[PDB]
Design a protein around this ligand. Sequence first.
Ligand code: 3PE
Ligand code: LMT
Ligand code: LMT
Ligand code: I49
Ligand code: SF4
Ligand code: SF4
Ligand code: SF4
Lengths: 176, 69, 101, 225, 307, 154, 174, 144
Amino acid sequence: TYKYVNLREPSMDMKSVTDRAAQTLLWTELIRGLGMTLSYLFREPATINYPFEKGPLSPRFRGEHALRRYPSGEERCIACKLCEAVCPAQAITIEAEPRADGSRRTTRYDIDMTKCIYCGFCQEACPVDAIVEGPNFEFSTETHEELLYNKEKLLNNGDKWEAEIAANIQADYLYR
Amino acid sequence: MWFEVLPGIAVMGVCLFIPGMATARIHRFSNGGKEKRVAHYPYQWYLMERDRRVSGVNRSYVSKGLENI
Amino acid sequence: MNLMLALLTNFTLATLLVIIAFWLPQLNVYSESARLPFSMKFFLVAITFLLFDLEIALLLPLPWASQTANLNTMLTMALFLIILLAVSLAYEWTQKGLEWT
Amino acid sequence: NLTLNFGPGVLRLVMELSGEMVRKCDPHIGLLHRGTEKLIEYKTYLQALPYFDRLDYVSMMCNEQAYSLAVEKLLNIRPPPRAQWIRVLFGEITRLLNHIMAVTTHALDIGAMTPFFWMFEEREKMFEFYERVSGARMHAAYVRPGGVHQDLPLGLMDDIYEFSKNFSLRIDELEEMLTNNRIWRNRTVDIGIVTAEDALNYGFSGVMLRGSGIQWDLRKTQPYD
Amino acid sequence: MFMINILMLIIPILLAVAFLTLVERKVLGYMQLRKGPNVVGPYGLLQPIADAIKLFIKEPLRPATSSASMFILAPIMALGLALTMWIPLPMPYPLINMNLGVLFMLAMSSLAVYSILWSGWASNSKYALIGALRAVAQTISYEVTLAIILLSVLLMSGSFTLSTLITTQEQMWLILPAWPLAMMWFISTLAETNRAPFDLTEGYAAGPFALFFMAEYANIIMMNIFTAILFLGTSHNPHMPELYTINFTIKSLLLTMSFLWIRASYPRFRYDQLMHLLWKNFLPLTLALCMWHVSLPILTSGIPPQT
Amino acid sequence: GEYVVAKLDDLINWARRSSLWPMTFGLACCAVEMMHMAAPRYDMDRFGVVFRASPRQSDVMIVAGTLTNKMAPALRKVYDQMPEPRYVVSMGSCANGGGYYHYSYSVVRGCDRIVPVDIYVPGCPPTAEALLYGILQLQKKIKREKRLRIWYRR
Amino acid sequence: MMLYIVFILSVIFVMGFVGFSSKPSPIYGGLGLIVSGGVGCGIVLNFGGSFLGLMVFLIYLGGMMVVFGYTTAMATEQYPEIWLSNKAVLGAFVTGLLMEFFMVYYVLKDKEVEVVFEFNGLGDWVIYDTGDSGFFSEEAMGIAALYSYGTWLVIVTGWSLLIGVVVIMEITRG
Amino acid sequence: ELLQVLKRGLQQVSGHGGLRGYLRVLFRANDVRVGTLVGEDKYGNKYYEDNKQFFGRHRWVIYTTEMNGKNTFWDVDGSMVPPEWHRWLHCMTDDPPTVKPPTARKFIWTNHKFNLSGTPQQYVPYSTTRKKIQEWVPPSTPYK
Ligand SMILES: CCCCCCCCCCCCCCCCCC(=O)OC[C@H](COP(=O)(O)OCCN)OC(=O)CCCCCCCCCCCCCCCCC
Ligand SMILES: CCCCCCCCCCCCO[C@@H]1O[C@H](CO)[C@@H](O[C@H]2O[C@H](CO)[C@@H](O)[C@H](O)[C@H]2O)[C@H](O)[C@H]1O
Ligand SMILES: CCCCCCCCCCCCO[C@@H]1O[C@H](CO)[C@@H](O[C@H]2O[C@H](CO)[C@@H](O)[C@H](O)[C@H]2O)[C@H](O)[C@H]1O
Ligand SMILES: N=C(N)NC(=N)NCCc1ccc(I)c(Cl)c1
Ligand code: SF4
Ligand code: SF4
Ligand code: SF4
């Protein structure tokens, strides 16, 4: 099914021709456009007062990465390397070895945040909720090097943001 | 809101009001409290020069009435 | 003399602002006639403007001329001059002198 | 004829002009060639999906759909009906996102700048729908071979309805600025006429065909989902 | 005393131009459903000051190997002429009471096109020269109608004295007898000042750029004061002159805002299209209305006085 | 005198950060989020950041998108034309370090190989708000400058 | 002294003429003519010809010289040569100043001079009219009479302007 | 209604504690709206809401004037909002941490830090693995 967007014949009676002449000489349709911008002048603007006000986000929001713990404080990550395997950008680098107590844990967990595409595939692939994209999006830096995250930086992000991360997971985990 | 544009318009309006008010008051100050004499044509200039001589102080805006007769 | 003072002040302040604009401190210590490919159409616009401008020069005295007693002659010549401006435009128009294609 | 190398997406145009008239137009592209097609050969099928968000990066989920449909065809599987309805729903939200971008930046380019601002607040509200289903405002990676990644959060359809209820009024305001404006018409009417036969032979598609009277739309003739 | 008077005109002109940059940004903002400057000072009141300081302490680049004599002469002429256009304006009294004031403004503005011509030469770039030559053609073309429209209006006024326009409009604004002329005058001032939808140049740096920008916006305010005087004459009470200044200032502000209102509302003409607007629409009508306004006072017996 | 220099430094710093005119190199998808920062919700112009500026009038360059090898000389030419002081904001993973295309034959692995960078905004793309955070971070960096203080201790 | 304003302007008038008459690059030859035009208007203004003075600004400078510069930027020079670079230009320029300076120096000393012909150096004010008091501008009344007395002048002038349009279009068609 | 509009404008001066308090928020936040105080965090940031504002402007924060020894009277940052309020302020949830507190964990930071880039506290990356190959150390005694 289709419709025509511009298949019409102007009427050629005197009243119609004189209507179009007046539009030509009195600029009536231009004056009409002025009316619409005038109406916007008296509308309340949509601007929010950043940084005192923030744009709304959802619990699914994909922001800065963090490494998480169990309630005991033990690391969740068990160096399975599923995140590294799935990462579309090859932004994750992992090394692991038996910990002094025999635990399977990483000795390296790096995320190049300038390779990362913030796709969230790592947190989908993780079987233990160890790596997540947190809610923080305000972490711009003055140097390139500051965006090469190692395990210490990522654990500190987990400890810094866990209060919010856990609540967001609580809201969305039944959708996963 | 739209009325937050008014402060900028008020500043501009005061800037445009000053030149007109300044010239009007400066003219009164320099012309004995009257309007500046307008002399577009030689007849009006001849009268203004005659005013300067008649004034006795060489100011066309000092005026002499019947007190001088 | 007033007009000279106003003119001298206007262009003197303009000069001062431009030279100051160039000579502010920088805080640095280290080292720092053919035929233009332009259409004939633009030449004809400038020439067309010039000839219409000369016609406007002749029409400028019209407010004073309307005070004449010989109004029949004055009105006839005023309309004669403007009509000839109209004919000039029509000649440019019909000869494609106002086209850009 | 005067020759000009215009331009520094980013476009380089080498144009031969004769006075005011364009004698030749030679677009020089590749300023945004990023070897996507080669990089995809080193990815699994899932890993390649986010590359499709970044092609027509105004129609993200429509690009995902095309790739997913291709993979599902090769897999010989089909997505479940609810995933298909979500994909059509967000495919049409994506069309609004694209068309707002197309019309208003088309208008902004020729000096009609205000409608861009009005309609990009509408775009910002649809970016919220993207973020609420996927956590990203643009590169959702939400439509995948086999369906979608997650179900809609509770309460989203209510907000899409609320957005849609008022949107046709926004279109009307855009039309008040452009549709009958004589300046807009002088800039657009009889510009770039393409015949039906030229359009088909040059490989045009979409509105580039329908603008010339050709009755073709793949959603009608070769429907999907 | 008179030196005080000169400075009491020049300095407010520059401050008014500076704060027009704020008003334009905010008016355009709210028409675009946003706010515009509201952080730098309360309600953006310090934004013009920040912009001006930023521009003057910016590196003042030059084209190099240019007619730098005319790189510096272009903005000096532009700003000097722009400030000169204000000295005969009656508000209600002019700084200089010129018998031929209306013709003095015509003469001075016709020179303003030189700063465009010189700046194109001074760029050393052949494509910048072409753009300058396109702007000159647009400017001189719309000079033609502005002069003929002005002459038509002065046939109801009877003199070239700007303050006589005040006398002519004691009973009624000239916009009523001459709204067709006022429509074309207003559009001509837009195309004359290269304003949208005639801003084809937008289709210098640091302080030199600021001086070109200030000269342009001085002319924009100037042309809108002239429009208010020419067509919306304010009644002048000799014993309360500031009543004139208030009312005439408001009219000038509203007309200047309408320049910003129009910029927010329309697309941009093509070059050939705004040339056809002048040569094939405005000029034919302007010539016909000039004939009509030459005949009209004679056939109604409403010829104005000379003096 | 140190009190006068400190105040003069504060004045010029305030003017330069209160009047940042950006030249946007809208190379790819990150340009769209830059558009949304100019759009009504965030209105960058309300901070004194005009929507669009010509290179010769711009104070900050925003590299918003992938920088390919073909494009790199053009970008460096525009940077060399900017009057000083000039700053560069690198927006998004592509500009920051190559991002998704880091291993491609045709892509510059980070625009900081071509121009000095002042601020790196992470994200693919960064949200409009995240970019605005970066601009406000650039302003604070300018607020820290002590050009006149260092000049008078030379 | 202000009593020699006309003489001072006429000195600048002549210096402007030596400027472009020595013929530097056309761009700077135009500027010298522009400066001469403005000074020439000043000379005319001081003899009571306000309208004639302004016509020089509006038609000569605002009209003809704009087209001269506009055409120069197209069909002639887009880039000037450094002013006074050529010896012929400099030698001609120096000679004109040397001739003018001696005329001024002698005329200002003896209040008279005999460069070919005899001139009085007392000041141009001595010859001015002494008794004026009309309620109008005599110059304006003379120019306005173009429409009352100059019917013939209007016809032949208006016809020449029309032919100018026709002729120039013929010339430039090629 | 213009009198009601002006009365409301006056009520903002009193709603902020007088002229001084009205001017402080005007210059610190470029906003003089009066909302309902939802709560205050341990760093001094104050959180307000007004549900009659349109979505996006219905919640805001007035940042503390000092946080972790940094003067923030004029230098406010979006990263000063601590995680527990971050969720509320960005509308990821409806309930503020005064109503639904976050779960306590021993390892969670007791003190939030804002963006530390550009300062001596900035992160510097480094390899977290130990040396892989051990080189032979020659004997310390002589015997060639
Ligand atoms: C009793 C006997 C009396 C005798 C006298 C009678 C005379 C009255 C009847 C004649 C009235 C004529 C009105 C004159 C106005 C100019 C008319 C005109 O030229 O408009 C047409 C012009 C071109 O028309 P277009 O559609 O583009 O193409 C037609 C060519 N095929 O299109 C345009 O010019 C449009 C303008 C483009 C710019 C748009 C931006 C301006 C829009 C806002 C305008 C606001 C109004 C101005 C108010 C000014 C106040 C000072
Ligand atoms: C409106 C008038 C206000 C008057 C205020 C007076 C304040 C005077 C202080 C001026 C401070 C200028 O500060 C200085 O500006 C120049 C450009 O102009 C910059 O640029 C300069 O230095 C850089 C290197 O540092 C050079 O590459 C550059 O070519 C040079 O021009 C400097 O990087 C900046 O340090
Ligand atoms: C009443 C006097 C009227 C005189 C009218 C004369 C008209 C001639 C206009 C000349 C304009 C000035 O000339 C322009 O500016 C100065 C002249 O010093 C030169 O600028 C500079 O040029 C070279 C370097 O390139 C230097 O050696 C010279 O010292 C310096 O002046 C420009 O290269 C020249 O292009
Ligand atoms: N065109 C833009 N970039 N926006 C804009 N309208 N800027 C105007 C900024 C400006 C320019 C010169 C001066 I003097 C002042 Cl006080 C302010
Ligand atoms: S978000 Fe995507 S690109 Fe970034 S680390 Fe996780 S899987 Fe890799
Ligand atoms: S973060 Fe998760 S997916 Fe990655 S290595 Fe650790 S346990 Fe495996
Ligand atoms: S960083 Fe992401 S959003 Fe930005 S240009 Fe690259 S792929 Fe596109």
